[PDB]
Design a protein around this nucleic acid. Structure first.
Lengths: 129, 129, 129, 129, 129, 129
RNA sequence: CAUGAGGAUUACCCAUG
RNA sequence: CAUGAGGAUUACCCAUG
RNA sequence: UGAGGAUUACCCA
RNA sequence: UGAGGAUUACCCA
């Protein structure tokens, strides 16, 4: 095995799909980027640490860019108008079994499923009400 | 267009599904919890605010109970041994359109899609390798 | 759903019934008032807080007014001769299940049921003996 | 006209009813408890005093045991995990007549009547939303 | 029950209507935002407070943006060329009954009805004459 | 041509309508007063000024009185028990066309339309919830 | 290390304990 | 935050730890 | 308080 | 400027 593989970050039905690939593991931080100039790339990082005597903490970060072409010094450069940042930390007690962890994963998937409250608000630029 | 409704957090296909329902709205912070004691419940909270002049920021928190060897309705100490905490912060620049936000949501869905690195690692009590 | 609804605070068989309605939720304090000038209204407030790592505390307050018409500066104003205050705090351990909570509610209902000791003393301006 | 008699605190319609009986009268503070160990009993106390020149004040306290997974007659620690505390303070101006007081009692009954906001929220481990 | 809902701010028949939706209710300040880029959105805020012993005071604010596209360095962002700022404070004595408040509301609606002096002056970039 | 005319401030069908009429236009401040005792009259004032290089600013004020009769020493005078004070400022950039201004006006009318959040809260002596 | 509906130029910074 | 059969002009104040 | 100014829940006399 | 207070075209920081 080896779970450090490439995957589809943004799925648009096999056309214009943002796919991300392993690009670095320096300092225990797994990194993935899209085939772009480092300045316009989507970026995903992940790291696990034994945060406490009885806890493990996953730190996941995703960077979604808004690509643009900027003219600096009369020259065009590939760049990012702005970036959206997702920072998530997951703390799991060492007593959690694999089935307990599967439960956490499913919860996170259900949380963001199309049609549910939260993803609906985010996509509509509104709050929950 | 009220989106503060109950939804399925953990989907086990009809049987054993965990539904989470509206339970509090104090301070604009929406809360959903499962039908359990608060020590063993699945909890979800969400709020949005203008983090700065250039950004808006969604703060999403999830609490998942350790289920293996759990005693329903019992007193389980220490608390830190029986619960997992998910803390998500999503920063979005004010220039993001609904379309941009829809993409950001897809990115989050892709990150956690079944079979991808991150969720597979979490579910197996592993890191990246 | 949504439990923030109006209800009958004082029941006098559908005639002269004091009914109270949602009027404010600012700062996480749910408020209800009767259709009156803010100076002569019945008022009910409720708020929940995670008072401790292992406790939740409900703070409920009710204000019963004695309406009157006062002549100030040679002018008649709707006002309250005096007000009666009820302040109750309920501390529930996070380990209490829904059935445990139902038990608490029933206890509070039984405590105040017509004919029982306490409501009998209060209504007769006496103590318990 | 002695009103210090036993009464039904939790009514389950004949079967499983919790009766609470006189157990102490030290210092004019009336006490009622269920037929249990004092660590698992239902307790009720009540006293009245002239809080100030303009008011009288009833202090009512109730203790409700956590029943789910309870071991009858056993030693359950920590105490704070197995008990709920209700603390009620009722302030009544000396001008209140018996009629005024009867109304104040109805207000308290209405507040807790079955199906109303407050009790429904408490019973569901919820807040207002 | 709830009045912290979505509503039509600008009515243009049934199409091109500007709808503002709840977004935040932090610190007793309710906020509504229209959809899409926060940068080009309409904003409405409202709050009430006891300004003094006898008065309650509503503070309402509205922001009407002039939608435009900013281009700099060849990078274009959705922005607001400028904004129009509405700012109103309404003081109401606590002796006001619901009847009195309805009158106050009709006064405000009348002040701005089509054809009347003030809305006509504003709409025509004019003053009084 | 003139917009400094009489108009209906409060519309109650066709009878009991409150009409306000021009009374003064000193120092760029237009004033309207309802008929009868000045002491019990409704008042409306309006003025515009170049607040800065880019902005013009409207300042509008309305006074709703609570009609009452004052009696002192057996002498009765027509007075206002109290007054409700509306106070609004509207800032509009000089780049706003007549089209833009009409939009701003519709926004104000929409903000106060019957049934919408704000006018409903005010009319009910309530806040947002 | 812990906690923040703390911030960001985003594997880094602040406050608090 | 904790405790008071502490007070009130009642979502706020006092004493104590 | 202000027919006080705004980058708009901030700031000046 | 101020979800700053009013006896409301005044006044405070």
């Amino acid at each position: 095995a080896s779970n450090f593989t490439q995957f589809v970050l943004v799925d648009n039905g096999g056309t214009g799909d943002v796919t991300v690939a392993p690009s670095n593991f320096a300092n225990g931080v797994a990194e993935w980027i899209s085939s772009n100039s480092r300045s316009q790339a989507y970026k995903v990082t992940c790291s696990v640490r034994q945060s406490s005597a009885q806890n493990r903490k996953y730190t996941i970060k995703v960077e979604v860019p808004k690509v643009a072409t900027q003219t600096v010094g009369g020259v065009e450069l590939p760049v990012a108008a702005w970036r959206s940042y997702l920072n998530m930390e997951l703390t799991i007690p060492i007593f959690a079994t694999n089935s307990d962890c599967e439960l956490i994963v499913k919860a996170m998937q259900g949380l963001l499923k199309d049609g549910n409250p939260i993803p609906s608000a985010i996509a509509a630029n509104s709050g929950i009400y």
